[PDB]
Design a protein around this ligand. Structure first.
Ligand SMILES: CCCCC/C=C/C/C=C/C/C=C\C/C=C\CCCC(=O)O[C@H](COC(=O)CCCCCCCCCCCCCCCCC)COP(=O)(O)O[C@@H]1[C@H](O)[C@H](O)[C@@H](O)[C@H](O)[C@H]1O
Ligand SMILES: CCCCC/C=C/C/C=C/C/C=C\C/C=C\CCCC(=O)O[C@H](COC(=O)CCCCCCCCCCCCCCCCC)COP(=O)(O)O[C@@H]1[C@H](O)[C@H](O)[C@@H](O)[C@H](O)[C@H]1O
Ligand SMILES: CCCCC/C=C/C/C=C/C/C=C\C/C=C\CCCC(=O)O[C@H](COC(=O)CCCCCCCCCCCCCCCCC)COP(=O)(O)O[C@@H]1[C@H](O)[C@H](O)[C@@H](O)[C@H](O)[C@H]1O
Ligand SMILES: COC1=C(OC)C(=O)C(C/C=C(\C)CC/C=C(\C)CC/C=C(\C)CC/C=C(/C)CC/C=C(\C)CC/C=C(\C)CC/C=C(\C)CC/C=C(/C)CCC=C(C)C)=C(C)C1=O
Ligand SMILES: CCCCC/C=C/C/C=C/CCCCCCCC(=O)O[C@H](COC(=O)CCCCCCCCCCCCCCC)COP(=O)([O-])OCC[N+](C)(C)C
Ligand SMILES: CCCCCCCCCCCCCCCCCC(=O)OC[C@H](COP(=O)(O)OCCN)OC(=O)CCCCCCCCCCCCCCCCC
Ligand SMILES: CCCCCCCCCCCCCCCCCC(=O)OC[C@H](COP(=O)(O)OCCN)OC(=O)CCCCCCCCCCCCCCCCC
Ligand SMILES: CCCCCCCCCCCCCCCCCC(=O)OC[C@H](COP(=O)(O)OCCN)OC(=O)CCCCCCCCCCCCCCCCC
Ligand SMILES: CCCCCCCCCCCC(=O)OC[C@H](COP(=O)(O)OCC[N+](C)(C)C)OC(=O)CCCCCCCCCCC
Lengths: 171, 86, 89, 127, 86, 469, 183, 340
């Protein structure tokens, strides 16, 4: 909660989780893949994440040890989402998060690869990207045409792929 | 009309700041490894950059994408030990 | 707590045993205020709250206005007597 | 080792080096009529203490309570979204309490120095 | 006031122990606050870590007396540019 | 409604001339009167000791504090009538008792700072309000700047107030370093058992108390009270006493305090025997404040002291205010006026006062037998109700030292009478100009409260039974 | 790597050293310049502890307004001063030493709550245990420290900001009202 | 380790040259305003004039008069030098190209411009003369009095961003500059910038005071080269402050379409070309601004101190209070507060 300052020393511990806790696959995705697939892991794994945080609320200060069984399932279902999005559109997912590698991981600077990825995942993985808390007669911001805030440099691969998807008629 | 001798030291100042900014951007991109700087870093973003440096293995922002993380990944987790602050 | 307590105690004794002029007494007062700040800011950092930082940012301003008021008091003291004594007021 | 602290260490070494190349390379050769402060080619006695105007001291005494407000407006400007509609009115009231003390200052003409160059107001009444 | 507001605006480090003590004092009249002692003891040692430092010097005094020293899974220290080296 | 007065006032004073200043104070006088009259009814909020906390754990409003508030407004209505009204219409008294342009500004900012202490729950509200009133006493002392003594006193008061402000701030942050808390509301009588909060709360109390005039550090305040002029000093004597003491009486952090008990003994001793062989009237009159601030430090040791305190407060405020107003009136009858800011100093200057305005001596007598504690007067029930709280609660050596201190302090009270009822060779037979009607009615009203104020003792207690219990 | 360990202790020593040049300096304004150095040592300690915001608030407000005010006073005013002669302050030295010992120890005493007096002091020195900093992912936005101060000065303690406005007003009115000489 | 020492070498050597040729360019353009050539006898077209001044100026001796403290006399050039030079970190020559990227770069830029007053005032007491001391008083009072409205203009601009980071301001600025809504703010920030360096529209010390050469009259050699460098570093530094918070920092136009014509992929020639465009836009802002300083020097007489204080405290500052009230109220009326 507070930052380490004044000569902090990093240390690691070679040790293992005990016998009674089963093993769990951990997420190997990085900040641009994770920020890319954030909306789709939030769309598929809403009740599991909600179960985890609601358990952690109900057992106060228990915290760590007593809702471990449910933090298993949130990691498992998000790994399921990212495996499925790899096998579905590895190329356009890659186009998206390689765009997000530049521009400070700003989501504002990568709209034209984001449209391709959202179409490809809604077509095949059939998850939709939505923003809740947004009452009607308020346009969602990744749908609007001529935004005020445009990126400095459109990346070249996604402009070319966006024009090719115009020409194919899939868009 | 316009005197070139007046604008010639301004041509120097313009060229020195221009070559300075260009050489600096090339040094920043060579430091990151082919990509741009991160110009404003949150606490969330700083923890996330540390996590990525733990994920990829050694390199700064290699930005790997794998389904399932490796096996040294569960064990290379670090805690930060801060001194007494007297 | 060592740096704030040592600044406070050494500044306090330098204030008390001042016999040489008056501007040393003003600056010993301000170094005291710095020491109380240091103790509090460390206690805010160790307790994970802005609360002592709230009292800190208020006492910064109050140390400022104390300087402004009291140095105008000195100019009033100097107005009638064109020199300030070495031994004190 | 960031490149922020090379700079703050590195400007001084440049300045110390230029001061050193002056001390090493120029001659020294002084005497008494070279020493002594400059006023227009004439020495004089300096008076031990001189008088001053109250506005001279009042500018920089008065400076600090306006400076302390400008740094008090600095916590608000960073949190301006969070305190929507409410911290706005509190900062309004804060600035207005300041502005009435400022209009006290401008009504008293505290920083203005008068001129004693009066054009002899009083007319010529005779006998 | 800012009773439990942290540096980021969140709850501070010992908020849960303090709110537990305030639960204890809410349902309790005077002349029966003697049962409210363990919540207060937990809060004060959340603040200052006195019993924790006492326990750690009790086990550190034993650590220096052994010639074997450490027979356990050890803790390895790393330099800051080697978070995810291996 | 002090805020609206200050905001309106300093804009209004910026535009008025110098000659308007007097009349401005007259306006403010009447303003404060209609804050007593038309706004008193808020006492109906405070039935059965219902307390409010306003602005979010920041200001505490009970009816103890409401009474302190009403007392501070009443004494300001008096002090403001002293500045805003002429004594006589001479060419003399215009250059002796003349207000500055910014005097009422600092007055109302001071009352604001003194109310934000008694109403205060937080410690930073405490610290900001002590700083506000401390600046105001700095500037009220230094506002009559064409005086050598007042400027020296303002500098002395600056440094000795700076030390005892940094001692309060060190005690607040020392309290914070052991408890993540700002209120003494968090203490709630379980914590004091298992936590060594003696040295903290006692050091906080001391750093608040040495600004009053408690006795190891009493000489500098007697010097400031002698050096300031005669009108500034009836304000700067009264206000920090009643504000800081009604803070410390409200929050009971020094009970069974051995240090407060030593300093109460030492205060009652070197206040009564301090002011014995003294010849200046403000000195004599400022060691009366040291002993009567000693009788308060006793009540800090007490639990449940809100009767003895408030009654002896309004006792001391009326008696205080009256004895300073009497020696304003004796200035017409003295044969020697020095020192334009401080026109009467030596106590032998009022010597023939019974042969010239004998009822000024009747007034002076009535107020000075009330300082001694003579039972037909209102000062006696104040000392009586302090004694009823001291003996209830186990302070038996404190009580007999109180009595010996009262007996020693009667000597230099009766020295005023001894000097006043004496023969004078040259008596006044007739005066052309007479004293201000609205200003001498205030002294007559302040006597008839002291004389015939033992009447209402019963009524007050019944009213005291309802709103504080 | 462990050259960067003793920094805090260095600043403490450095801060100690600076105060001895404040109270003992032949020229006044040289000692006020040492006080400016002490503000810089304080801001070093405040960056060093983790409060980088405050360090620049100290350099802005204390150094850039309060010290500029002080130097500006010392220039155009008359102040006599005597040097630190041994003969005038050797009489002070024993009460100096007694007060150093007592005020230092007793300042170190109230951080601790054993009833025994010697156990109060030793808990002042038992700090050599290293606090463990854990990463919690519960915060989603860059609320810095100055943002939180601007939320608590403005909602929970808005009245303290407003009484503070009255204090800043007083700091305007006062120096003016002294140094006017109206008409 | 090799890469951060070569970047700070190249930024140092680009800024320390560009403060030398500023003075050459100043004598050039001030000459052509007055219908005469500048220097042309020192290089092929007059260039490296400043190097002739500097190499001779390092060879003059240093005299330290008898009334002076000799330390203070030589340490005020060092502290004025470093303070005018430490502020060159935080400027960006492109997105996140600084010499230290910190989250609060305005508070640093505003605390260093507060440290520059001392080398005026402190330099008045070295060689204590009553005709020199009072001139240092007038200079320091002017200097702080216009630093007030400088700091205030900053806080009015940070009302729109609510972030003390600087490249965050310039990225915020891509939708519209801040000069074009806030046009009177450009004019009063320009004149407060002219005041804060004590340029000779707003000068009294160098010309009019009882010293013939300002507060630094009695000097020679290194204490003059450090003050001379510090004034023109202050020129281009407050020019940089104007360049990022009021005009576009590195922003000229969109230039996405020109890239989608020219390039194919991210490569080092593309980052080089983008860096040249960004720092070219920043440089042409900064060069038009130093030309504005030299242009206002040419045409005007100077100020009495009474005119100067009556200017700042009685005219500009009440207008600034009206600006404090009107701009958060405009952000209030429409539903737009800036988010962190
Ligand atoms: C070149 C290209 C780049 C340009 C660099 C800057 C330009 C440098 C050009 C500089 C040329 C040298 C000019 C310096 C020069 O002549 O003063 C001559 C030295 O006589 C050489 O023995 C001359 C020996 C000087 C040593 C060479 C230093 C080279 C410059 C390094 C930078 C003065 O004799 P001097 O002993 O009485 O002078 C001494 C001495 O200057 C002081 O340190 C003493 O305090 C004083 O008592 C005084 O007596
Ligand atoms: C100004 C500039 C700022 C300066 C800062 C530097 C220093 C600051 C500290 C100074 C602070 C101001 C000093 C204030 C005076 C000290 C006040 C003070 O003693 O309270 C003492 C603390 O009882 C220690 O156990 C106290 C023991 C303390 C240890 C003595 C010191 C150790 C020296 C070693 C040689 C307590 O009082 P108290 O009568 O209520 O305590 C009584 C009684 O003692 C107990 O038996 C009862 O149980 C208790 O209920 C109560 O009735
Ligand atoms: C519970 C207890 C709490 C509070 C009790 C305190 C006071 C009672 C409250 C209000 C008392 C209200 C009194 C109003 C009526 C009193 C009253 O006859 O007028 C005044 C004084 O008038 C105040 O001085 C008005 C001043 C009021 C300020 C009183 C503050 C004490 C006395 O007449 P006066 O013959 O001298 O007045 C005459 C006559 O008016 C003129 O025409 C003549 O030219 C002139 O010679 C003059 O002498
Ligand atoms: C109206 O007449 C006047 C003028 O116009 C002719 C002036 O220019 C001026 C101003 C005077 C000047 C511009 C001449 C002084 C110029 C200099 C001393 C140039 C200094 C050169 C440097 C400091 C070089 C810095 C470079 C490095 C350190 C190399 C980095 C590796 C005045 C005062 C004046 O009165
Ligand atoms: C139309 C409104 C008229 C404006 C009245 C303003 C009065 C300001 C004066 C303040 C100080 C003067 C003393 C007032 C005593 C109030 C007692 C009270 O009642 O105090 C009680 C308890 O007191 C105490 O602890 C002890 C105080 C003891 C006073 C000792 C002095 C006695 C002699 C004077 C009193 C009798 C004079 C009557 C003459 C006909 C609580 O106070 P409360 O909350 O009930 O306030 C009442 C609201 N009242 C004012 C609007 C009615
Ligand atoms: C940046 C690089 C650092 C360069 C510093 C080098 C200092 C060398 C200058 C020197 O030797 O001392 C000069 C100093 C002059 O002062 P003084 O002559 O005593 O009084 C004259 C009043 N008109 O004479 C002194 O009194 C000495 C004061 C400084 C002490 C340094 C001693 C230098 C020793 C040389 C070996
Ligand atoms: C100390 C001198 C006075 C304090 C100045 C503090 C200036 C400052 O704020 O430094 C900030 C900067 C890191 O701050 P931050 O914004 O979090 O960087 C984010 C990176 N993305 O800090 C840095 O980048 C480097 C810190 C430079 C100052 C370090 C000096 C340590 C002083 C040790 C004194 C030893 C005696
Ligand atoms: C309906 C909406 C409201 C409409 C109003 C809008 C309000 C916002 C506008 C704000 C813009 C303010 C600009 C600054 C205004 C300064 C006012 C001024 O001119 O100074 C007046 C002053 C004389 O004062 P005074 O006593 O009143 O004179 C009466 C004579 N009996 O005379 C002086 O002090 C001397 C003048 C000094 C001016 C400084 C000049 C220095 C540099 C000039 C910068 C030029 C910029 C060029 C840059 C490049 C341009 C391409
Ligand atoms: C790019 C920025 C620098 C360009 C300036 C070049 C001018 C020049 O190089 O000048 C040529 C110089 C001196 O020539 P001069 O005799 O004084 O000129 C006489 C002609 N007149 C009469 C018209 C004036 O010769 C040299 O050996 C300089 C060699 C060292 C060069 C240092 C460069 C530092 C950068």
């Amino acid at each position: 909660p507070r930052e380490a300052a004044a000569h902090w020393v990093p240390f690691e511990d070679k040790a293992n989780m005990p016998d009674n806790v089963p093993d769990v696959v951990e997420v190997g995705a990085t900040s641009a893949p994770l920020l890319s697939a954030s909306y789709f892991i939030g769309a598929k794994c809403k009740p599991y994440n909600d179960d985890f945080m609601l358990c952690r609320e109900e057992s106060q200060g228990s915290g760590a040890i007593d809702c471990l069984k449910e933090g298993r399932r949130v990691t498992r279902c998000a790994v399921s989402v990212i495996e499925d999005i790899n096998k579905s559109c590895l190329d356009e997912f890659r186009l998206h998060w390689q765009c997000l590698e530049q521009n400070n991981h700003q989501l504002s600077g990568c709209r034209k690869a984001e449209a391709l990825l959202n179409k490809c995942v809604f077509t095949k993985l059939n998850l939709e990207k939505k923003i809740p808390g947004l009452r009607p007669d308020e346009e969602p911001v990744f749908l609007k045409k001529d935004p005020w805030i445009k990126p400095a440099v459109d990346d070249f691969k996604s402009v070319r792929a966006y024009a090719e998807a115009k020409k194919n008629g899939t868009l | 009309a316009i005197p070139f001798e007046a604008l010639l030291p301004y041509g120097i100042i313009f060229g020195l700041l221009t070559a300075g900014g260009g050489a600096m951007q090339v040094l920043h991109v060579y430091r990151n490894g082919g990509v741009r700087d991160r110009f404003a870093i949150d606490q969330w973003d700083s923890q996330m950059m540390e996590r990525d440096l733990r994920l990829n293995g050694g390199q700064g922002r290699k930005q790997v994408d794998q389904a399932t993380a490796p096996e040294a990944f569960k064990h290379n987790h670090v805690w930060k030990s801060e001194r007494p602050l007297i | 707590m060592f740096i704030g307590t040592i600044i406070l105690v050494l500044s306090f004794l330098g204030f008390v045993f001042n016999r040489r002029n008056i501007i040393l007494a003003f600056i010993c007062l301000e170094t005291m205020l710095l020491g109380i700040n240091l103790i509090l800011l460390r206690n805010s950092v160790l307790f994970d709250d802005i609360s002592g930082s709230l009292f800190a940012i208020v006492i910064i301003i109050l140390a400022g206005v104390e300087s402004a008021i009291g140095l105008s008091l000195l100019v009033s003291y100097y107005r009638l007597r064109g020199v300030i004594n070495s031994y004190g007021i | 080792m960031n490149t922020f602290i090379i700079f703050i260490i590195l400007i001084p070494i440049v300045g110390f080096a230029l001061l050193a190349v002056n001390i090493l390379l120029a001659v020294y050769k002084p005497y008494n009529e070279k020493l002594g402060a400059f006023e227009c080619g004439l020495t004089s006695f300096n008076q031990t203490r001189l008088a001053f105007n109250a506005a001279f001291i009042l500018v920089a005494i008065l400076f600090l309570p306006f400076d302390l407000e400008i740094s008090t407006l600095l916590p608000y400007v960073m949190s301006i979204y969070l305190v929507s509609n409410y911290g706005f009115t509190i900062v309004l009231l804060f600035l207005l309490i300041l502005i009435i003390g400022f209009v006290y200052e401008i009504n008293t003409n505290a920083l203005k120095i008068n001129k004693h160059n009066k054009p002899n107001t009083d007319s010529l009444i005779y006998k | 006031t800012a009773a439990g507001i942290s540096l980021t605006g969140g709850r501070n480090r010992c908020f849960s122990e303090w709110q537990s003590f305030m639960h204890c004092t809410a349902k309790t009249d005077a002349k029966s606050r003697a049962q409210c002692l363990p919540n207060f003891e937990d809060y004060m040692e959340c603040l200052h870590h006195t019993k924790e430092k006492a326990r750690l010097r009790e086990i550190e005094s034993v650590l220096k007396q052994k010639k074997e020293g450490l027979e356990a899974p050890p803790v390895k220290v790393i330099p800051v540019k080697a978070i995810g080296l291996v | 409604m002090l805020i609206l007065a200050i905001i309106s006032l300093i804009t209004f004073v910026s535009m008025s001339k110098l000659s308007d200043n007097r009349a401005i104070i007259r306006l403010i006088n009447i303003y404060l009167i209609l804050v007593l009259v038309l706004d008193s009814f808020l006492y109906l909020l405070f039935l059965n000791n219902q307390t409010y906390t306003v602005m979010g754990e920041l200001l505490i409003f009970n009816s103890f504090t409401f009474y302190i508030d009403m007392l501070i407004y009443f004494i300001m209505i008096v002090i403001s009538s002293l500045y805003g009204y002429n004594l006589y219409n001479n060419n003399l008294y215009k250059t002796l008792f003349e207000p500055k342009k910014e005097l009422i500004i600092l007055f109302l900012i001071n009352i604001l700072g003194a109310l934000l202490i008694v109403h205060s729950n937080d410690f930073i509200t405490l610290f900001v309000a002590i700083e506000l009133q401390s600046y105001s006493i700095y500037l009220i002392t230094a506002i009559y700047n064409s005086s050598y003594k007042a400027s020296k006193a303002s500098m002395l008061y600056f440094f000795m107030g700076g030390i005892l402000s940094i001692l309060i701030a060190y005690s607040i942050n020392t309290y914070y370093s052991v408890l993540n808390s700002y209120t003494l509301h968090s203490l709630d009588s379980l914590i004091i058992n298992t936590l060594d909060l003696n040295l903290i709360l006692i050091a906080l109390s001391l750093g608040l108390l040495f600004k009053i005039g408690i006795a190891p550090l009493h000489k500098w305040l007697i010097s400031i009270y002698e050096n300031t002029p005669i009108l500034i000093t009836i304000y700067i004597s009264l206000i920090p006493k009643i504000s800081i003491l009604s803070y410390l009486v409200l929050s009971n952090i020094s009970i069974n305090s051995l240090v407060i008990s030593i300093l109460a003994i030492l205060t009652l001793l070197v206040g009564s025997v301090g002011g014995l062989l003294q010849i200046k009237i403000k000195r004599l009159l400022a060691f009366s404040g040291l002993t009567n601030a000693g009788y308060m430090m006793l009540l800090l040791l007490l639990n449940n002291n809100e009767f003895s305190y408030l009654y002896y407060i309004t006792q001391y405020s009326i008696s205080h205010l009256a004895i300073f107003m009497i020696i304003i009136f004796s200035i017409y009858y003295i044969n020697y006026i020095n020192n334009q800011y401080n026109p009467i100093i030596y106590v032998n200057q009022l010597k023939g006062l019974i042969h010239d305005n004998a009822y000024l001596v009747l007034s002076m007598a009535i107020v000075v037998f009330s300082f001694i504690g003579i039972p037909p007067l209102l000062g006696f029930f104040g000392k009586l109700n302090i004694l009823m709280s001291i003996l209830n609660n186990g302070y038996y050596f404190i009580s007999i030292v109180l009595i010996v201190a009262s007996l020693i302090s009667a000597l230099y009270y009766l020295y005023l009478l001894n000097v006043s009822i004496q023969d004078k060779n040259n008596i006044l037979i007739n005066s052309n100009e007479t004293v201000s009607s609205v200003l001498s009615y205030i002294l007559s009203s302040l006597i008839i409260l002291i004389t015939f104020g033992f009447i209402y003792n019963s009524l007050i207690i019944d009213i005291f039974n309802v709103y504080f219990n | 790597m462990y050259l960067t360990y003793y920094f805090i202790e260095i600043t403490i020593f450095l801060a100690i050293l600076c105060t001895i040049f404040i109270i003992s300096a032949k020229n006044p304004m040289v000692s006020i310049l040492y006080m400016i150095a002490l503000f810089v040592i304080a801001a070093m300690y405040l960056y060093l502890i983790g409060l980088g915001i405050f360090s620049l608030l100290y350099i802005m407000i204390y150094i850039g307004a309060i010290a500029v005010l002080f130097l500006f006073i010392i220039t155009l005013l008359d102040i006599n001063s005597t040097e630190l002669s041994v003969k005038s302050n050797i009489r002070d030295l024993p009460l100096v030493l007694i007060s150093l010992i007592v005020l230092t120890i007793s300042g170190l005493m109230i951080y601790s709550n054993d009833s025994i007096l010697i156990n109060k002091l030793l808990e002042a020195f038992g700090n050599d245990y290293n606090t463990i900093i854990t990463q919690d992912w519960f915060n989603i936005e860059n609320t810095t420290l100055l943002t939180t101060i601007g939320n608590v000065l403005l909602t929970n303690n808005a009245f303290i900001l407003l009484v503070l406005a009255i204090v800043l007003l007083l700091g305007i009115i006062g120096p003016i009202s002294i140094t006017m000489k109206h008409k | 380790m090799i890469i951060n020492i070569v970047e700070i070498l190249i930024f140092l050597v680009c800024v320390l040259f560009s403060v030398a040729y500023l003075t050459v360019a100043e004598r050039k353009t001030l000459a052509y305003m007055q219908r005469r050539l500048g220097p042309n006898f020192v290089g092929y077209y007059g260039l490296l004039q400043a190097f002739a001044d500097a190499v001779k100026l390092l060879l003059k001796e240093i005299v330290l008069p008898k009334e002076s403290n000799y330390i203070i006399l030589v340490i005020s050039p060092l502290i004025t030098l470093i303070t005018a030079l430490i502020g060159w970190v935080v400027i960006p020559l492109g997105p996140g190209i600084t010499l230290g990227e910190l989250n609060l770069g305005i508070l640093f830029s505003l605390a260093i411009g507060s440290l520059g007053v001392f080398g005026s005032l402190l330099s008045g007491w070295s060689s204590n003369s009553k005709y020199s001391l009072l001139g240092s008083i007038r200079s320091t009072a002017q200097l702080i009095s216009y630093e007030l409205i400088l700091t205030s203009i900053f806080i009015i601009i940070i009302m729109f961003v609510s972030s003390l980071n600087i490249t965050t301001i310039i990225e915020t600025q891509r939708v519209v500059w801040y000069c074009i809504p806030l046009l009177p703010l450009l004019l009063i920030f320009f004149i407060a910038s002219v005041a804060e360096t004590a340029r000779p529209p707003f000068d009294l010390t160098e010309s009019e005071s009882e010293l013939v050469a300002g507060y630094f009259t009695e000097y020679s050699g290194s204490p003059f080269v450090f003050f001379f460098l510090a004034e023109y570093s202050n020129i281009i530094l407050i020019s940089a402050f104007n360049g990022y918070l009021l005009l576009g920092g590195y922003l000229s136009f969109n230039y996405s379409y020109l890239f989608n014509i020219l390039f194919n992929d991210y490569s080092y020639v593309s980052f080089l070309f983008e860096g040249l465009i960004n720092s070219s836009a920043y440089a042409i802002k900064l060069v038009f601004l130093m030309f504005s300083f030299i242009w206002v020097r040419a045409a005007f007489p100077r100020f009495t101190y009474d005119n100067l204080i009556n200017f700042c405290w009685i005219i500009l500052l009440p207008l600034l209070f009206g600006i404090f009230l009107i701009i958060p109220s405009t952000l209030y009326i429409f539903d737009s507060f800036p988010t962190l």
